[PDB]
Symmetry: D2
Subunit: 493 residues, 4 copies
């Protein structure tokens, strides 16, 4: 019903007064300094992502410190996300450093570890010990970004596969491999992940972007690797292959949210199907009320060019129409030449998409899916958003200590900002991956526990006033739903 809303739109009308989508930026050499991080924050960054595929603990500690210093100097709360290297399948070494794979040739891939430093075009090592059990004759094995496609012909022996080379390509040492028709059964967390997750907990990161999640039991393995001290850290599962996509329901249920990793998906799945897998995964997350991030190949050509291509811009806008909470930048900010400009243009595109998005379709689709009787929390949050639309209120205020009720209200997609007043700074940071929400910290130690809620309500309404969301005479819908509840339709003074 976007369709009827399209007919009423004008591209010459003003954009909204708030941007709902959130921007995650990956930190690297273009962006790690305190000053650069301040430029990012002012450009629209809400979340700093550390890519633990590269870089030492000392290197990531510097990001951690610089982010916190940059956010304190600007007076804001910025989330810190640890993105794990994850389990990997790699080839071994080749003799002469290199190996020249010709089309039509026969080669032998083995998991015999004797071969890790003496592969040749004839026979080389792949380091995934279960390779033979997981693959069958006819299956494909991809190497080097999926560029070299070997096809499996037979089991030469219990550790070695006879392969055909289907296309020509020179491959150097230790390329990554994929297995598109194959259920890969590597552990959820490598030995390096286990050390790296323990470091995130010690340093108080807000969320883990957990690589290569294939099943619900693996989300529980990440959680157990975080330990009892990491219990409040959110686990965002990165969906990267057909197994993640097949098992998406049970993964969603166990996770705190989802990353749609379109570039990794596209190694094993046709790009046009990844487009559809994106729609599916975003809508399931919207229904679960959990944050979903659209990641990889976002404004990629703006890594070295001052503008993106028109198709890239349409890609970011459509992520927002699909329902994404968050859009993520990778090399565009980590190693690019226009980090501030790419964040600002991404914010711009998101704002323009939002101005055309009919939010009421989301609200009404999600509400129609609810079973009667609803539980109290789902009834209160849905009816508070419905009151926004019925009175044309201009803001909501949600008192939420853990963020749970702020996410439940954002799930129902009011067409106005949501201000979450919370007593925890970690909730302010974790809400940066939920669309349409801004957080206000209420220091209850100094200010009092505020049992009757009046002070936290007034702080929320003041914040909305100071941002111009509301003025004297507008309506503001207030809600509390503590996991006791209460809704109010407040006439702003």
């Amino acid at each position: 019903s976007q369709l009827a809303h399209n007919l009423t739109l004008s591209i010459f009308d003003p954009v909204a007064n708030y941007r709902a989508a959130r921007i995650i930026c990956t930190i690297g050499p273009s962006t790690q300094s305190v000053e650069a991080l301040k430029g990012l924050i002012q450009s629209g960054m809400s979340v700093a992502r550390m890519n633990f595929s590269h870089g030492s603990h000392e290197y990531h500690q510097t990001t951690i410190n610089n982010v916190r210093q940059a956010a304190a100097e600007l007076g804001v709360n910025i989330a810190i996300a640890l993105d794990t290297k994850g389990p990997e399948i790699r080839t071994g070494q080749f003799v002469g450093g290199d190996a020249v794979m010709e089309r039509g040739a026969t080669c032998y891939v083995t998991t015999d570890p004797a071969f890790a430093d003496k592969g040749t075009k004839d026979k080389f090592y792949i380091d995934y010990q279960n390779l033979s059990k997981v693959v069958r004759p006819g299956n494909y094995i991809y190497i080097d970004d999926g560029i070299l496609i070997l096809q499996v012909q037979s089991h030469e022996d219990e550790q070695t596969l006879e392969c055909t080379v289907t296309n020509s390509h020179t491959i150097s040492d230790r390329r990554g491999v994929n297995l598109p028709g194959c259920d890969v059964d590597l552990p959820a967390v490598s030995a390096k992940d286990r050390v790296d997750l323990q470091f995130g907990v010690e340093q108080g990161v807000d969320m883990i972007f957990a690589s290569f999640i294939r099943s619900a039991e693996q989300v529980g393995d990440v959680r157990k690797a975080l330990g009892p001290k990491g219990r409040d850290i959110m686990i965002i599962c990165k969906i990267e292959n057909h197994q993640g996509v097949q098992n998406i329901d049970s993964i969603i249920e166990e996770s705190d949210g989802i990353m749609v990793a379109r570039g990794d998906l596209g190694v094993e799945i046709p790009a046009e199907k990844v487009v559809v897998a994106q729609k599916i995964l975003i809508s399931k997350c919207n229904v679960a009320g959990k944050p979903v991030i659209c990641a990889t190949q976002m404004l990629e050509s703006m890594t070295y060019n001052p503008r993106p291509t028109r198709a890239e811009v349409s890609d970011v806008a459509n992520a927002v129409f699909n329902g994404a909470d968050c859009v993520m930048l990778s090399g565009e900010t980590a190693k690019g030449k226009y980090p501030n400009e790419v964040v600002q243009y991404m914010a711009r595109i998101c704002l323009e998409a939002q101005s055309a998005l009919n939010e009421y379709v989301f609200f009404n689709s999600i509400k129609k899916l609810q079973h009667i009787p609803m539980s109290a929390d789902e009834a209160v949050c849905s009816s508070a958003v419905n009151s926004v639309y019925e009175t044309k209120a201009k803001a909501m205020v949600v008192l939420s200590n853990t963020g749970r009720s702020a996410r439940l209200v954002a799930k129902y997609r009011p067409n106005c900002p949501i201000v979450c007043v919370t007593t925890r700074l970690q909730t302010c940071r974790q809400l940066n991956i939920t669309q349409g929400v801004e957080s206000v910290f209420f220091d209850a130690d100094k200010l009092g526990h505020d049992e009757g809620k009046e002070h936290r309500v007034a702080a929320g309404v003041e914040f909305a006033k100071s941002k111009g969301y509301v003025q004297t005479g507008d309506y503001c819908v207030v809600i509390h739903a503590d996991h006791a509840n209460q809704t109010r339709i407040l006439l702003v003074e």
Copy 2:
């Protein structure tokens, strides 16, 4: 309610047994031969587009001839579209054939025809005589694809504008200019267009893609130039700038359909805003029941590379999700290295997208916008589509001689194939720009007037059976639509 439908999808399920979206291909050096046109047709081309920006009438005649021969040998009907050159604003010549424009510098643009062969970085000619009346201080004037941006400071005299150069560039001879802040008031059709359009009428083209349409009155000018022998030829308006967007409602009402020229709109409008105008223009056409084409910058990187980028793939898929009837290839087929593969890949993307699209949302959205009381045609066609969803029928058969009622059924977006049985070959060709329809030609000379309609009905049901759309025991909804009639047929 696309959202509820996304939840139940699996990308591992089979795709639909038909592709609804239609593919238009521009013919040029890579594709004009008879054998290359057969390749395009087999790859998924429904429409051959002739770009009259280039090529003589003899050249285009060879395209027309060769298309007809290719389609005849494959036993299919292919539409031929004549895409007009249109009005252009161009600069004149520079001295030395070049002009090095520099940031901060001052220059003078004049409409004094004295300067057409003798401009310089200092002062040159722009051939649009109304330049000064239409522009104002502050306005920008883009030249060379919008690369060179000049800002207008003042009227040096009644024909000359003093401009700042806002950024550097060299510009060679005769570049095209745009006026993003400006209501350009050039003629609808130029003398060359009138000449081309009459030639289109003589050669029997099925539709005009009319460039640079800015207002409703201008559609009438194209219709005039086509003359009384061109009255059955479709006019599709190309929307290429802000005036076209602003006046969209009155243009749609006069035209037979719309082309969204993303790349031309993008000269004066930010790219994120053109994404949104595309949504709007396509939805307005879906509601009007008129074809809409998404054109330019489709799978462009596939002109020279064997695969497009992932972002280009999503752009194609999202045109189909926005509601586009057609997607159009330009240089990918006119001059590219992989014309067959690009069309096959476009068809594959369209079919993947369609298999996710909830057609019921479009049907229900459009039905709710109908004014009660409805006129009989609207009532019959919308209720015939409603009957598809109520009975889970597996095809529709629509008897339509002019294709009018076939477009009317298609507008309501049934979730099954529509087979249109028509006695006019021109109708078979013109319905190639309507999504979701396949035409079956019923030869009324060779077979009779069939005024009981039975033979024509059997021919449509026989076509749907041969495609595997229906078998024994399926329902097929049959319609003829001022007399009309709907039957829900149990298939034998």
Copy 3:
């Protein structure tokens, strides 16, 4: 959604141009002559009911002949209904002709046939041989219209019940008894019913109003008693006690329609619950697409008074709002003093109720109950009525030989007349108990089988024109659905 339609109404606006509800009249001494029957027909009678509780075969043959003669002289098709006496429970005789039952007294009720002509206040016979098996201690036994209420205390023996007399009342010979908390298991058809049903078949009656229907198997017993020659006669089941009401779904499924006998129901059930049983039974019949008649105590005081009471008039109007196809008159026309006036006032009240009834609520409630996928017939009839509302058509034409598709269209309640063109006179008569339908007979023997349907369509449209329903420029929705189908939206010429 009657509620929103009420707000728009004016009682000073004109009534509709057609009356949808149908009137059934019972024939007796006030009405049996040919001339009186003509007055009834002109007053609004569509169905002549013969009450076979009284009167000989010769007497009912006279009604049959006079009705047919009266309808032929007026050029119309009038249905003839045979209403069966049905099984009855009666007391025997008392000594001295009479017996004086006092409150507080003990009496004995026996099924010993020795006592049929020698009852006394002390002990008398009830002729239902299963009385003892069906009743238990605490149960009530009603006698004389329910006026004398005995309560069962114990089984004196296997054929005799010791009773308390709960209220005083003199009772004469052979009163009817009821058993309100009791499942009565008398046969569906008495020996007299069996002779009487055979007579209806020989004389070609159109429908049977089958008395005291308690279960689905009893509808099949009526059907079997009609025999193979009575297979096209409709069976309308009279619901008269709690068993009929409990088993109403399976009875509806087996019957051709329902009579709500409010006076008989009210002997054993509280009047306020009968009001609700009426709503229930009419709506189940509306959903089944089968005619339902609201019968007994309709304008009863107009039997001897020239006007009815205000509550009586509100009762007839509310039967029409509840959804009744038909309203029935009993003594008001059989033995009353104002037979023409009561029919005319009943037609008047029905017309006024209809003018306020929102038909679109019926259509939309019934359509929302349909399961997808619908069968073709249900899809065609529902979509033809929907087209009436979408185009504001002013009539429908349905070609129906058996009446089945005309009833299926009437079920969906268009807000315009329905003209059924049929090749059978018995269909014209049977459609007189379906609301909103008028029939036109098409004599296919003389006029041709009309394979392409054009002649039957034009006869239907001419009929609508001659009644003023449509004129040049209006829309008329035509439908055929033969148990092949076709719908057309015709511009009237």
Copy 4:
């Protein structure tokens, strides 16, 4: 969607645990004593109606006193309604105390006051001075309950009408007349009404039933007569003729509620049309959120017989189905032989009807009629009722001091009891004419101002528990409604 709800009902299921509809009883000789008033209260009376057509102020004073004592001894709050005499048209006296009017005969009706004590079948007085201006040839003039119908032929002179007698009747002294074709322009309130209304204010009545209301302006006259000390007293307009019906919308907007006087409307309007006006007037009030009473000819035959007729029972049930807040007894309780049994039986019929009524239809019908944007009160109350249906809550508790928000919640028709907690006894009494609400008095002197609201909330939840409406683990929706607040309470 009452239809879908009928399909799932069984008359053998238990009835609801509360009765929503309210019963008003007219007090007279059968019922004025303290013990008889206790009987009515225990039988189901919520409102004592005083008919000021008869009885002196001393008489009515004894009704007021006795009602208060009866209610005090039973621990309940009962509303007291003052039903005004109103304007009347009457004939004058006849000679011999009688006048034998005969079919076809001619007679003269005059407003000449000379004839008030000396009329005859030939010429008599009608005391409405505007008779001649308001009537025209053809119009009918009813006299004696509409029994004697005269037709107006001509103006004999400016004060005298020549009439045909259209049917026979004798008519004794001082009968009342009606004018069905006629816009009667008598005063809103007579001098006697002004006197009665001031006495109502001094004695603290809760509401006025204002007779013969014909226009909005006339409601203001009643409000004037009540004066500034009577500003909190409800004015319920009695709609008794065609002008009242015609002007219904403007009367509702000025009044606090409506009484549908079926028997008075039936003097000039056919009975089948009064059935329909009743539907209309009740629906308009339900939408306005104002109480509506169905009055006259309710269970009339039960004045002298121990049971009513079946048609009377259905009339009572259908008033509740039409949406009536109240049903009203007149002579059945004022002078009848079975005042307790008639009220018990009315309550039983109302409870049977309610257990079949789909309350969701009313809620949804009224919600769909709301203009967006809604004002905050409307939004809170409709969403609080929505939350009842979404969570299957088993009671509502509404804190309301003036009863305004309690009437606003009741308007939306939740399918559970509403408990209103109020600090005003007058509010407890006035809510007796609103369906579905029970009031709990919170004594703010004896217990404090409770500005945290907690004690009042507990008192309402405690009341709902004591009635068996909620138990541990049920939900209760709590509302206060310009500050407001809704909580969905899990019951402890």
